Amino acid sequence: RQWALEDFEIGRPLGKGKFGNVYLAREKQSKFILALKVLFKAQLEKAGVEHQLRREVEIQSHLRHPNILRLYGYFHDATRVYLILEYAPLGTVYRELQKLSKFDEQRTATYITELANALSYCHSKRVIHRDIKPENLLLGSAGELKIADFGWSVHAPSSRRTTLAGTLDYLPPEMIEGRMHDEKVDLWSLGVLCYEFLVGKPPFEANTYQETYKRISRVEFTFPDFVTEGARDLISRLLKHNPSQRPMLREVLEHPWITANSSKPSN
Amino acid sequence: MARVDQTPRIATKETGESLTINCVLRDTACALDSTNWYRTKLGSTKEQTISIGGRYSETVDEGSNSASLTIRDLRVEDSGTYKCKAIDSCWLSREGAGTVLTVKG
Ligand SMILES: Nc1ncnc2c1ncn2[C@@H]1O[C@H](COP(=O)(O)OP(=O)(O)O)[C@@H](O)[C@H]1O
């Protein structure tokens, strides 16, 4: 495997992941700054995710889009896998949401546009995402959103029992009801994110798993009074129980609330 | 010497027929346990993932270090170049040389 650790200067940790740390790094010949994600093979294997991650990394290697974190390459030694990643200097959308409590309409519409552009590019390659959480979205130097979790699939359409345990909050009804799912799951994800960005919490949040499950299955959510008519409309269209009733990504990108408030355009 | 043999290299089929593509990872102890399938349709420049399910099925044979793709009820739209692309159990990149499929109809 041609890249090797000595190709890079290593700096401070950017964060600690489940299977290892992510470091600030610099390729020595170009001085290009990037991120080096370290994963311990034994840790992946014991978690039973080692096969799945190799599938996801292969998929990720084809995805070149301004709002998808770039995978530059990878290499390994006897105990560790190293992923060479685009460096996202402004951290996670999760942290930004913690800092600001909630996002204004222009920031929100702009993120949704960037997500829709990314997902539109993916769908054109017959690639679908799993659940999209704020913690898995990173921010680039100009504050541009990057889908960063390699959470790609693989099979469409599909009926295959998801880890439902974990966090239900971001899963669409058809996945928690054990029904068939396809690329329409990504539109549900956009609705949950649009809501969480504006409100500060996801719309089906409850105190127990069983309660959250019912909220999602029955699509029981309400809006704070400050959420405007245009946002309510878009979110309500995305959070349809019936996946086929959800809009196309192009329709999201063309929604009056998005076009009035987004500082970014389509493609 | 380690390599992927993808067969057949060229396939010409009539509509409604079937195609099976085999990929075998040879001369290495690394395991081909998780291959993804890709297609660039004739005329297009866009590489797409092949979704498994429906007309598209796959098998993997641990013992022979191989994986296969079968497409049923072939359509003219299916014409294009198909590849297995994978990261083997050694975390090394592997890919077949491709199958150029032409469907007439
Ligand atoms: N490419 C990157 N650029 C900048 N910071 C990153 C990058 N990747 C990860 N980080 C930081 O390090 C943490 C790494 O954890 P993450 O990639 O979420 O690990 P996990 O495998 O547990 O999801 C993130 O929360 C983020 O703060």
Author numbering:
A (entry chain A): 126 to 392
B (entry chain B): 1 to 105
The paper states:
To address the mechanism of Aurora-A inhibition by vNAR-D01, we crystallized the complex in two different forms and determined the structures by X-ray crystallography to limiting resolutions of 1.67 Å and 1.79 Å, respectively. In both crystal forms the asymmetric unit contained a single complex of Aurora-A KD CA/vNAR-D01 with a 1 : 1 stoichiometry. The two crystal structures are very similar, with an overall Cα RMSD of 0.97 Å. ADP is bound in the ATP-binding pocket but there are no magnesium ions present in the active site of either structure, and the side chain of Asp274, which coordinates magnesium ions in other Aurora-A structures, is displaced from the active site and instead interacts with the side chain of His254. Crystal form 2 was grown using 0.2 M ammonium sulfate, 0.1 M bis-Tris pH 5.5, 25% PEG 3350 as a precipitant. In addition, Asn36 and Tyr38 from βC interact with the αC-helix through an H-bond with the side chain of Glu183 (and van der Waals contact with the side chain of His187). These interactions are mostly conserved between the two crystal forms of the complex, with the exception of the contacts between HV2 and activation loop. Structure determination was carried out with data from a single crystal cryoprotected in 30% ethylene glycol using the WT complex crystal form 2 as a model. The interface of the complex buries 950 Å2 of surface molecule per molecule of vNAR-D01 or Aurora-A. The binding footprint of vNAR-D01 on Aurora-A comprises regions of the αC-helix, β4 strand, activation loop and the N-terminus of helix αE. The distortion is stabilized by interactions on all sides: the side closest to β4 is stabilized by Trp91 of vNAR-D01 CDR3; the side facing out to solution is stabilized by Asp33, Asn36 and Tyr38 of vNAR-D01 CDR1 and strand βC; and the inside is stabilized by conformational changes in the activation loop, most notably Phe275 and Trp277. The position of the αC-helix is incompatible with TPX2 binding, as side chains of Glu175 and Arg179 would clash with Tyr8 and Tyr10.
Aurora-A is a Ser/Thr protein kinase that functions primarily in cell division and is overexpressed in breast, colon and other cancers. The activity of Aurora-A is stimulated by autophosphorylation of Thr288 in a flexible region termed the activation loop. Here, we describe the identification of a vNAR single domain antibody based on a shark heavy chain antibody scaffold that binds and inhibits Aurora-A. The crystal structure of the complex indicates an allosteric mode of action that is antagonistic to the mechanism by which TPX2 activates the kinase. In the crystal structure of the complex, Aurora-A adopts a canonical kinase fold, with a molecule of ADP sandwiched between the N- and C-lobe. vNAR-D01 has an Ig fold with two disulfide bridges. vNAR-D01 makes contacts with both lobes of Aurora-A, but does not closely approach the ATP-binding pocket.
